[PDB]
Amino acid sequence: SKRTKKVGISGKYGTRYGASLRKLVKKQEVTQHARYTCTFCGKNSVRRTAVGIWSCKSCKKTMAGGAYTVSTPAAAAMRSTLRRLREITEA
Amino acid sequence: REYATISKPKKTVQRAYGGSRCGNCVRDRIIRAFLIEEQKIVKKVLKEQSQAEKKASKK
C-alpha cells in the first residue's frame, strides 16, 4: 500500500524547501537510515551512529565509514589500487 | 560510596576478574591467551628451523 507516489521519506517536509532540494535530501536520508549487512558477523544489523560512524547491533563492532553510506566508492577504489600497489611493492 | 559499607563477597564473583569482567569475556581471555602462546611457540620453532637451514646453506 504505497501512500505517496514520489516523495517517499521526504513527505515529512511537506511543501517546503523546493522539490529539487527534497529530492536531493531523499537519497542521503534513505542510505543513511538503511540497515546494512555486517562484514564481520554477516547479520543485517549495521546502522549509523553518527556521521561517518557505523555500528553493528549484534557483534558490537564500530567502523569508520562514509557520511551517509557505510562505504564510499572512492574508498573501495582506494582499497583496490592499494592492494595492487602492495603486490607490486612486495614483489 | 555505599560499596565501602558491604563485605567483599557481595561486591565480587568468585572467579578470576570477578566483579570487573564477565564470564564470557574471561573465557575468551583464557582461550585467546592459550592459543596465542601456543602460536608463539610454533613461530619460534619455525624461525629456529629457518635459521638452522640458513646456517647449513651458508656453511
Binding site: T37, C41, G42 | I31, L35, Q39
Partner: protein, 95 residues
C-alpha cells in the same frame, strides 16, 4: 568445485552445521572434515584449528562468508563452521 562437492555431501553423506555441533564432532573424533568460513572470528578460527590439530582432522578454509557457506550447504541460514562426518558419494576428502 567445492560447492558441487558440498551439494553432493549434503545429498548423500552426513554433516552437522554450526559451532557447538562441530566442536562436539571434533571431540567425538568422528569428524572427517571441517569447513571454516572466511568471516569467522579469528579467535574461534584458531580454536577450531587447534581442536582439529588435536583430532587429526583436515580443515578447509571456505573463501565465502557464513551466508555463502549456508547457501552452499543448501540452507536459508548462515553457517560459520560445519563438519562432515560421512563423505557419502562425494570425493571431498580426497584432496
Amino acid at each position: 568445485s567445492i560447492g558441487a562437492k558440498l551439494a553432493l555431501v549434503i545429498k548423500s553423506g552426513k554433516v552437522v552445521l554450526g559451532y557447538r555441533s562441530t566442536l562436539k564432532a571434533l571431540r567425538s573424533g568422528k569428524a572427517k572434515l571441517i569447513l571454516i568460513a572466511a568471516n569467522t572470528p579469528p579467535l574461534r578460527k584458531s580454536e577450531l584449528e587447534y581442536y582439529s590439530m588435536m583430532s587429526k582432522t583436515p580443515v578447509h578454509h571456505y573463501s565465502g562468508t557464513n551466508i555463502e557457506l549456508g547457501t552452499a550447504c543448501g540452507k536459508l541460514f548462515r553457517c560459520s563452521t560445519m563438519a562432515i562426518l560421512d563423505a557419502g558419494d562425494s570425493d571431498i576428502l580426497a584432496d
